[PDB]
Write a protein that binds this ligand. Structure first.
Ligand SMILES: Nc1ncnc2c([C@@H]3O[C@H](CO)[C@@H](O)[C@H]3O)n[nH]c12
Ligand SMILES: Nc1ncnc2c([C@@H]3O[C@H](CO)[C@@H](O)[C@H]3O)n[nH]c12
Lengths: 229, 229
């Protein structure tokens, strides 16, 4: 059984490598450094894609075609779009959308691309397992729609826009592309995020502050799940 | 010698398959249908990625890791940002940038992503060869910076913005990601585009009109180049 674990930033995967505490082989490919090791009976490939949609797509595809993972778990941080989501909160993506896609000129709804779809779904069984665990350690796991684009979101306007147009709970920059690629290759994917800011004028400050911690929380949970696979 | 030929839309590759007039095997992978055939002494893999940055990244990576192409030539249409570029004109990308990337909140210049770069360069030798040929058939080949994002551009404002911020000549939605991936894998890439609109309020109309033709022109040239490899 092969499992792929992804993060966007180095900070986000460092805790992961530690929690697994196993020796990791380093395999460079496509500008990414993949950490390959063995944990229990499962083979785990870890890596940080780097920021954005292009980076994340590239890395997920490589992960699938070169290492042939069978599952993909993503952990990272995200900004909040709603009240009931607060710093350090954990969220599991139900559907993801690319909020910055705009073929409006062709009278298409926002987020739509011909031969594609607005919303991408994630693994039913993985998400189920996430809720099980979250309920086994009294962790308040919130689930919902995550919006992804290549813009760091930090303004009240854009905030309201994502909520009204897509009814999204969280915003980030790699979820959707990751989920998209996995769907194309039929790989079950789970996208987990930990709030690190509220995507407002002060999101930048708040983000620099909670990155480390929020990254960790997310990592702990993800390790919990791998243990159960 | 393996060569990869990419287009964004089916319309754009259909002419290509014809001009080569050889039988093509159809190999589906990742939601894309790859056309594999033999032309002269070279092996050519053709395909349309579908629209956008995520689609184009996904497809280029697959093309490289599963088929191991050694070169990548892209042909498609683009909107114009400057006067000296008109409908049906042919352009060869010198540098490409993702104009919709914004980490400004972190006091970064637009288009910049940590561990990356704003501008991506394309193949020096391929572009050279493009100019040779263009000069062998009295074709006015214009060269320049191409801007790519996940928004169909059609407004005077955005127009001025791409020019002033990046000094771009053309705008589209797949060039940069394609060039990026190739650079990461060290594959020489050439991005050729044929104007199909002026990226203004009427870009949508003009586009529906010239798509077919502009797609063809671009295809003819690209076939000319493959003949010389
Ligand atoms: N409010 C926000 N808007 C867009 N992305 C993010 C993020 C995530 O943090 C990184 C931006 O520095 C990037 O990987 C993105 O997914 N946190 N908060 C965000
Ligand atoms: N003015 C414009 N702005 C953004 N993309 C395009 C295009 C290209 O045509 C397609 C949009 O329908 C897409 O593949 C894009 O690269 N033509 N004109 C464009």
């Amino acid at each position: 059984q092969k499992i792929g674990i992804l993060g966007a930033m180095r900070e986000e995967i460092t805790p992961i490598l530690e929690l697994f505490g196993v020796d990791f082989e380093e395999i460079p490919l496509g500008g990414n450094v993949f950490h390959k090791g063995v944990y229990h009976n499962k083979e785990i490939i870890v890596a940080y894609s780097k920021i954005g949609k292009v980076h994340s797509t590239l890395t997920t595809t490589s992960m699938i075609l070169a290492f042939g993972v069978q599952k993909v778990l993503f952990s990272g941080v995200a900004g909040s779009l709603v009240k009931d989501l607060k710093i350090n909160d954990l969220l599991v993506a139900t559907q993801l959308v690319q909020h910055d896609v705009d073929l409006s000129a062709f009278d298409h709804p926002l987020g739509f691309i011909p031969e594609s779809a607005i919303f991408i779904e994630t693994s039913g069984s993985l998400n189920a397992l996430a809720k099980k665990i979250a309920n086994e350690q009294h962790i308040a796991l919130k689930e919902g729609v995550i919006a992804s684009g290549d813009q760091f979101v930090h303004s009240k306007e854009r905030k309201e826009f994502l909520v009204s147009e897509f009814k999204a709970s969280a915003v980030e920059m790699e979820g959707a592309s990751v989920a998209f690629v996995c769907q194309k290759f039929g790989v079950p994917c789970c996208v987990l995020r930990s709030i690190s800011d509220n995507a407002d004028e002060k999101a930048g400050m708040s983000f620099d502050e909670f990155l480390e911690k929020s990254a960790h929380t997310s990592a702990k949970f993800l390790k919990s799940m791998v243990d159960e696979l």
